Design an enzyme around this catalytic site. Structure first.
Site, short mmCIF file in Angstrom:
data_model
loop_
_atom_site.label_atom_id
_atom_site.label_comp_id
_atom_site.label_asym_id
_atom_site.label_seq_id
_atom_site.Cartn_x
_atom_site.Cartn_y
_atom_site.Cartn_z
N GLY A 24 -9.78 1.18 3.31
CA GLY A 24 -8.75 0.64 2.42
C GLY A 24 -9.10 0.78 0.95
O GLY A 24 -8.45 0.18 0.10
N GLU A 25 -10.16 1.56 0.64
CA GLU A 25 -10.62 1.84 -0.72
C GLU A 25 -10.21 3.25 -1.08
O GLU A 25 -10.37 4.16 -0.26
CB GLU A 25 -12.13 1.65 -0.86
CG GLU A 25 -12.54 0.20 -0.73
CD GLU A 25 -14.02 0.04 -0.51
OE1 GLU A 25 -14.81 0.39 -1.42
OE2 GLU A 25 -14.40 -0.33 0.62
N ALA A 26 -9.60 3.43 -2.27
CA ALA A 26 -9.06 4.73 -2.69
C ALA A 26 -10.10 5.86 -2.69
O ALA A 26 -9.81 6.94 -2.20
CB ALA A 26 -8.42 4.61 -4.06
N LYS A 42 -12.85 6.16 -1.07
CA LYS A 42 -13.24 6.40 0.31
C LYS A 42 -12.18 7.25 1.03
O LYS A 42 -12.52 8.26 1.65
CB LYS A 42 -13.52 5.08 1.03
CG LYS A 42 -14.79 4.41 0.52
CD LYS A 42 -15.18 3.19 1.30
CE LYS A 42 -16.51 2.68 0.78
NZ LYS A 42 -16.71 1.29 1.21
#
Length: 347
Positions: free
Chosen positions: A103-105, A107
Site C-alpha cells: 500500500g506504499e507508492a 513499493k
C-alpha cells in the site's frame, strides 16, 4: 531442486519467516553462506515455491523494498516468471496476482518497474522498451479497476478510441500500434484483475485523515500546499529541535497513487522517521480509494535497522496527530508489540 540443506530446513524457514520475516530470511542466508549457495536466487525461489505457506503481505513487502538485497531478490523473483508468448495484459495480471500488493507508492512502483523490465526483456517484439511497458502497466491497472467496477457509470468509462487518444506519444515518444491497443483494451475489458492489496502497511497508519478532522494534518498539508518548509508542528515534540526535509515523488507516480512525498524527520539523538503523505489524485483511486492517508515509520539507515530512538520518534510523530492510529503493523526490524507499546506509552 535445492541443496539438501535448504530442502531439510523448509519447515523451520516457513515458521521462522511467518513469526518474524527477518529471521526466516536470515536463516536462508546462513544456510547459503555455510553451504556455498547463491542467496538471492534461494530467497526468490523460496517465495515462489512456498507461496501457499507464507505471510504474502511480508513476501510482497520484502520484494518491493529499497535496499540492494531486496532489489536483487526481486530481479531474480521476476526473471523466474515466464512471460514469453504471454500477452501484455496476461503477463501483468499474472504478475500482480502473485502478490499482496503493498500500500506504499514506492513499493508498488518497484514491482511495476520489475514486471516492465522483465516483460520487455522476454518480449522485445511486443513493447518498444521497459518505459513504454511501465506507462501501459499503470494505465492497464487503473482502466481494469474502473471498467470492472459496476458502480461507476458506464457513460464515464474510457472506450477503445478514448484509450488510443489517451496513449498518444506514450510509445517511445510515438504511438502504440492501433491493433495492439484494440487487443489490449479487449483483454482489459474481458477479465477483472481482482487485485489484493495489504489492508495496512508496516509501521503506523492513519486512514481517512483530513485538514478538517486533524489540526496536525491541517498544518502539515498547509506547508505542502503553499510549498513552504515544514516546521515542527508536532505537539509531542515541542521541546525537540528537529531537522525536517521533504522528498518529492516523481509526478507520474504521485498521479497514479496519490503519494505527495515523504517528510523526513531527524531529532537531536540520531532518531530518524518518515511520514508518507497520500491524498486523492487524478489517477489514484484504485490504489488509494477516496480518502487521504499517512504512513509513519522509523527510518532504516545505511542497510541497518532503525535505532530504538527512531522507533520512539516514529511513535512521537504518530501520537502528535489528533487522529488516533487506524493500524499498527510490524516493520521488518520491530515487532508489532514494540510499535504498539511505544505508541501507547506516548499517546
Amino acid at each position: 531442486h535445492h541443496h539438501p540443506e535448504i530442502e531439510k530446513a523448509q519447515r523451520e524457514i516457513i515458521e521462522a519467516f511467518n513469526a518474524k520475516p527477518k529471521n526466516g530470511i536470515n536463516k536462508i542466508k546462513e544456510i547459503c553462506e555455510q553451504y556455498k549457495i547463491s542467496p538471492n536466487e534461494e530467497i526468490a525461489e523460496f517465495f515462489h515455491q512456498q507461496r501457499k505457506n507464507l505471510d504474502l503481505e511480508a513476501v510482497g513487502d520484502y520484494l518491493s523494498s529499497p535496499e540492494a538485497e531486496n532489489q536483487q531478490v526481486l530481479k531474480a523473483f521476476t526473471s523466474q516468471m515466464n512471460f514469453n508468448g504471454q500477452s501484455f495484459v496476461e503477463g501483468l495480471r499474472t504478475f500482480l496476482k502473485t502478490f499482496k500488493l503493498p500500500g506504499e507508492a514506492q513499493k508498488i512502483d518497484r514491482l511495476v518497474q520489475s514486471f516492465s523490465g522483465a516483460y520487455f526483456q522476454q518480449n522485445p517484439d511486443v513493447v518498444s522498451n521497459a518505459d513504454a511497458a511501465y506507462l501501459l502497466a499503470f494505465q492497464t491497472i487503473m482502466l481494469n479497476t474502473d471498467l470492472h467496477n459496476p458502480s461507476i457509470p458506464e457513460k464515464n468509462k474510457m472506450t477503445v478510441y478514448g484509450l488510443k487518444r489517451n496513449l498518444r506519444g506514450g510509445n517511445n515518444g510515438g504511438d502504440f500500434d492501433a491493433k495492439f491497443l484494440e487487443e489490449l483494451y479487449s483483454e482489459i475489458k474481458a477479465k477483472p484483475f481482482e487485485l489484493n492489496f495489504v489492508d495496512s502497511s508496516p509501521g503506523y497508519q492513519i486512514n481517512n485523515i483530513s485538514s478538517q478532522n486533524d489540526k496536525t494534518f491541517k498544518q502539515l498539508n498547509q506547508f505542502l500546499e503553499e510549498k513552504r518548509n515544514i516546521q515542527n508542528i508536532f505537539p509531542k515534540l515541542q521541546n525537540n529541535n528537529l531537522t525536517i526535509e521533504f522528498k518529492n515523488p516523481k509526478t507520474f507516480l504521485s498521479k497514479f497513487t496519490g503519494y505527495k512525498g515523504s517528510v523526513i524527520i531527524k531529532d537531536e539523538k540520531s532518531g530518524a522517521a518518515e511520514i508518507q503523505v497520500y491524498k486523492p489524485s487524478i489517477f489514484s483511486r484504485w490504489f488509494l480509494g477516496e480518502k487521504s492517508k499517512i504512513i509513519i515509520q522509523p527510518l532504516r539507515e545505511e542497510g541497518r535497522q532503525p535505532s530504538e530512538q527512531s522507533l520512539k520518534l516514529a511513535a512521537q510523530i504518530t501520537a502528535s496527530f489528533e487522529t488516533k492510529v487506524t493500524s499498527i503493523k510490524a516493520t521488518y526490524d520491530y515487532l508489532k508489540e514494540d510499535l504498539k507499546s511505544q505508541y501507547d506509552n506516548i499517546r
